Design an enzyme around this catalytic site. Structure first.
Site, PDB file in Angstrom:
ATOM      1  N   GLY A 143      41.839  12.644  26.978  1.00  0.00           N
ATOM      2  CA  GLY A 143      41.952  13.856  27.782  1.00  0.00           C
ATOM      3  C   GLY A 143      42.811  14.954  27.180  1.00  0.00           C
TER       4      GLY A 143
ATOM      5  N   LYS B   2      39.104  17.707  26.508  1.00  0.00           N
ATOM      6  CA  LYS B   2      39.241  19.078  27.028  1.00  0.00           C
ATOM      7  C   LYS B   2      38.395  20.080  26.279  1.00  0.00           C
ATOM      8  CE  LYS B   2      42.505  18.521  30.393  1.00  0.00           C
ATOM      9  NZ  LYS B   2      41.837  18.801  31.683  1.00  0.00           N
TER      10      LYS B   2
ATOM     11  N   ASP C   4      42.996  20.089  36.936  1.00  0.00           N
ATOM     12  CA  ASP C   4      44.227  20.245  36.181  1.00  0.00           C
ATOM     13  C   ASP C   4      44.153  21.385  35.168  1.00  0.00           C
ATOM     14  OD1 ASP C   4      42.400  18.590  34.429  1.00  0.00           O
ATOM     15  OD2 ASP C   4      44.189  18.393  33.175  1.00  0.00           O
ATOM     16  N   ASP C   5      45.325  22.022  34.916  1.00  0.00           N
ATOM     17  CA  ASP C   5      45.547  23.132  33.984  1.00  0.00           C
ATOM     18  C   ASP C   5      44.614  24.335  34.274  1.00  0.00           C
ATOM     19  OD1 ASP C   5      47.758  21.918  32.771  1.00  0.00           O
ATOM     20  OD2 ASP C   5      46.666  21.253  30.986  1.00  0.00           O
TER      21      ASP C   5
ATOM     22  N   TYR D 169      50.057  17.994  39.181  1.00  0.00           N
ATOM     23  CA  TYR D 169      49.944  16.604  38.693  1.00  0.00           C
ATOM     24  C   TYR D 169      51.268  15.890  38.264  1.00  0.00           C
ATOM     25  CZ  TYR D 169      49.216  19.016  34.087  1.00  0.00           C
ATOM     26  OH  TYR D 169      49.322  19.798  32.958  1.00  0.00           O
TER      27      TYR D 169
ATOM     28  N   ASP E  10      49.365  17.180  21.478  1.00  0.00           N
ATOM     29  CA  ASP E  10      48.632  18.426  21.499  1.00  0.00           C
ATOM     30  C   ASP E  10      49.482  19.564  22.167  1.00  0.00           C
ATOM     31  OD1 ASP E  10      48.425  17.391  24.064  1.00  0.00           O
ATOM     32  OD2 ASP E  10      46.276  17.748  24.239  1.00  0.00           O
TER      33      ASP E  10
ATOM     34  N   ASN F 277      47.014   8.965  27.382  1.00  0.00           N
ATOM     35  CA  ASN F 277      46.466  10.096  26.645  1.00  0.00           C
ATOM     36  C   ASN F 277      47.334  10.088  25.402  1.00  0.00           C
ATOM     37  OD1 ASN F 277      44.807  12.472  26.274  1.00  0.00           O
ATOM     38  ND2 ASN F 277      46.271  13.738  27.432  1.00  0.00           N
TER      39      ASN F 277
HETATM   40  C1  LIG Z   1      46.530  14.662  34.454  1.00  0.00           C
HETATM   41  C2  LIG Z   1      47.150  15.827  33.804  1.00  0.00           C
HETATM   42  N1  LIG Z   1      46.239  16.540  32.916  1.00  0.00           N
HETATM   43  C3  LIG Z   1      46.689  17.120  31.799  1.00  0.00           C
HETATM   44  N2  LIG Z   1      45.924  17.776  30.971  1.00  0.00           N
HETATM   45  C4  LIG Z   1      46.634  18.251  29.769  1.00  0.00           C
HETATM   46  C5  LIG Z   1      46.109  17.391  28.621  1.00  0.00           C
HETATM   47  O1  LIG Z   1      44.876  17.924  28.159  1.00  0.00           O
HETATM   48  C6  LIG Z   1      47.095  17.297  27.468  1.00  0.00           C
HETATM   49  O2  LIG Z   1      46.548  16.444  26.468  1.00  0.00           O
HETATM   50  C7  LIG Z   1      48.414  16.724  27.979  1.00  0.00           C
HETATM   51  C8  LIG Z   1      49.453  16.536  26.895  1.00  0.00           C
HETATM   52  O3  LIG Z   1      49.842  17.767  26.308  1.00  0.00           O
HETATM   53  O4  LIG Z   1      49.005  17.606  28.947  1.00  0.00           O
HETATM   54  C9  LIG Z   1      48.172  18.082  30.007  1.00  0.00           C
HETATM   55  S1  LIG Z   1      48.414  16.934  31.376  1.00  0.00           S
END
Ligand SMILES: CC/N=C1/N[C@@H]2[C@@H](O)[C@H](O)[C@@H](CO)O[C@@H]2S1
Ligand SMILES: CC/N=C1/N[C@@H]2[C@@H](O)[C@H](O)[C@@H](CO)O[C@@H]2S1
Lengths: 304, 120, 120, 302
Positions: free
Chosen positions: D10, D41, D117-118, D162, D228, D256
């Site tokens: 992820g 992603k 997320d994000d 999250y 990342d 991850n």
């Molecule tokens: C459940 C939370 N989802 C997330 N998506 C991003 C990920 O794509 C990254 O790989 C991660 C590490 O930098 O940080 C955030 S945490």
């Protein structure tokens, strides 16, 4: 006249794949360049394990590659680095080399190179007795392999003292380069990287001094855009610090570019532009800054 | 006598234990990593006979970081190496310069490197 | 009324021009980058013209970040992935430099890096 | 008792290739792990252009991949991230999302995940009308997909808030989290990263604080070895900072890891040694787990 201009894939690290290589030829052709020197340090069969023959698929892929080179009017040069564990005086070795290059010839290759770069100056007892110097031993096998291959059109030799700051005790007073200059056959071309390994500038003056002692005009193996030494740096700058006044005073320019295949657009583009800007020059014409806007414009289209 | 055939030495668990301490966690370095970072700072400050053994040990420690890359670079499975070549390559180099420094104390990274050098 | 569909601005020639000045040559920085450095060096030489320069410097930092942003969302992901680490690491050090310059008026890198720092 | 322990691909950046993913399963199976959460992603057809249906060549690839997961006794959880440009109220959107997942079900996928997320915390004016808070819209479309998909045994939901340092005002009193806890169906599991995006530690009381509001045990999406956020760093250290005393208080741990697939040996192997050490609720030593991991890895080089 005859001028070798292109890329040398001679870096350390992860080498290029066939797909990437066929693309290099396509680009090399488009920009009117003419040569590709196959010399990835990290190919087992190329340097460390030079004795080994190519398997059915290994042979299959090289055959393909060599055929693509022909198809895009790019001269393919197969280089080989035996210098690490080779016994010069042993004829079994000479025959293993002969047998190895024969297999490559059968894939379509007609251009070869012998490299003795990045290797210790000391010979073993057998070689120490037989040959007067390390230069003598290299000159002997190279000349033998030149003639064995049937004195081909393009045959390249790489000295251990391949750049200015590697010549003992200096460029003009080097017994190594002297032995090479005298005893190495005239048909064979010599590789040079300039004053330093990664030369900031390659002055006409330095190319005269080295051209004297080797009794021929070198083929530059340029490290301007090479990034193996610092994989945290990448070079997108234009080809700069090599006078168009060099093109008449040299046999060619082969660029050792960034490890990262795709980031070499500006480097190989500006190089083509450089060469072409004084192609037929006998003995300003090239703006790096102008070469760059041209390179970057042509590159931009690739992104879309 | 003839020229010795090229032989590659295999990766040791010691090589891999150094590798895991060099690239450990986001919030801390491995004991071997922190230990080496300490020994360089102490040997930097000082310019007894103890500094001879401490600089000699450190030069040997730096030499393992180098050996580790050579043996990783020489194993049959290139895939693992090449999948993290950049990282291993750098430390090996920085550690080689740092090796010369200490020897001389007894007688890079580009533009992002330049701005990262000015931050507190 | 509804949420506008995801779209990305393509790569401009000015992006490439900046990129090439950031990752320029092995003995010289590209005009834009050479400049981009001189400014951060100056804004770190004072903490009270200054506020007008820092505003124009933060503009530049944004350009670096936007450059990555557009470079990534482009169709050709081959070019991107081939030099992702470089562009990403420049983008990042620019964020932490922009953030530090915003803070100046309104008042990492691994073990390999920590060893590089402690050198002339 | 069901516990989701495994890996989550992820991260941002170049996704893993099929042959790597297939190998991942062999490694997970070997180490008595059971789950794989597909969430790259940078896969266009997962986050940015989620609406796009899979191509024919692409479909054959996924089908083979899901088959590999079945063969290696690994649960393949397929995640989708619409949050960027979805219009929650428009039923044409919800329909397109249903059509996408339906295609994925044809490949042989039984477990799914909806990720929010994000993403920008702002709703479009159209959605603003139809739904009270952002959480109301998310809980609505999720419950709908859960039910439409015939309430799968495994359905994961990723909230926008999250981790702790993302909860406004705080975890115990977040009006977003309350909505999730109450209105989100008790069938669906909720993803959590701990007190931070890259939690140094994951204290038991932090998991008791969030479980309270989410009204269930969360499934951890761990970022301990994720790299990342500065690709200048590689993490070969051991899974550390999480009590074996969390295992009975969680529904899972999906890590991850490093973008460099080969780099994740030590992080997956140590995650395994951690879970295995106390499945049934100092049983674990990171320093010890590391040696074990390192001895196994040494074999791959020869
Ligand atoms: C459940 C939370 N989802 C997330 N998506 C991003 C990920 O794509 C990254 O790989 C991660 C590490 O930098 O940080 C955030 S945490
Ligand atoms: C013709 C000279 N041969 C050389 N071999 C090494 C190459 O393998 C490197 O790629 C290059 C850049 O680091 O520098 C020296 S020059």
């Amino acid at each position: 006249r005859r001028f070798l201009c292109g890329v040398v894939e001679g870096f350390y690290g992860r080498p290029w794949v066939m797909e990437q290589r066929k693309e290099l030829f396509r680009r090399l052709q488009k920009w009117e360049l003419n040569t590709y020197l196959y010399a990835p340090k990290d190919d087992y069969k190329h340097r460390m394990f030079w004795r080994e023959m190519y398997s059915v698929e290994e042979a299959e892929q090289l055959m393909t590659l060599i055929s693509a080179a022909r198809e895009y009017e790019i001269e393919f040069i197969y280089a080989i680095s035996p210098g690490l564990d080779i016994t010069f005086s042993n004829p079994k070795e000479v025959s293993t080399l002969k047998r190895k290059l024969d297999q490559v010839s059968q894939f379509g290759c007609r251009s070869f190179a012998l490299l003795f770069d990045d290797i210790d100056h000391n010979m073993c007892a057998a070689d120490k007795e037989v040959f007067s110097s390390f230069a003598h031993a290299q000159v002997s096998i190279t000349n033998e392999i030149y003639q064995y291959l049937g004195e081909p059109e393009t045959f390249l030799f790489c000295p251990t003292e391949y750049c200015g700051t590697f010549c003992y005790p200096n460029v003009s007073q080097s017994p190594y380069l002297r032995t090479v200059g005298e005893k190495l056959l005239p048909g064979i071309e010599v590789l040079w990287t300039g004053p330093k390994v990664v030369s900031k500038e390659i002055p006409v003056e330095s190319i005269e001094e080295v051209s004297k002692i080797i009794k021929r005009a070198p083929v530059i193996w340029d490290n301007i855009h090479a990034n193996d030494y610092d994989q945290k740096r990448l070079f997108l700058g234009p080809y700069k610090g090599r006078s168009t006044e060099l093109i008449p005073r040299l046999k060619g320019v082969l660029t050792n570019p960034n490890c990262e295949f795709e980031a070499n657009y500006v480097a190989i583009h500006t190089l083509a532009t450089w060469y072409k800007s004084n192609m037929n020059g006998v003995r300003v014409l090239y703006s790096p800054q102008m070469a760059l806007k041209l390179a970057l414009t042509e590159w931009l289209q690739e992104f879309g | 006598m003839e020229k010795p055939l090229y032989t590659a030495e295999p990766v040791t668990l010691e090589d891999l234990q150094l590798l895991a301490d060099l690239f450990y966690l986001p919030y801390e370095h491995g004991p071997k990593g922190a230990q080496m970072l300490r020994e360089f700072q102490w040997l930097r400050a000082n310019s007894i006979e103890e500094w001879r053994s401490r600089a000699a040990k450190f030069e040997e420690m730096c030499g393992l970081v180098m050996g580790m890359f050579t043996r990783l670079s020489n194993c049959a499975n290139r895939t693992i190496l090449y999948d993290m070549y950049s990282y291993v390559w750098d430390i090996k180099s920085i550690m080689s310069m740092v090796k010369s420094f200490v020897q001389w104390l007894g007688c890079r990274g580009g533009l992002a490197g330049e701005f990262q050098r000015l931050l507190p």
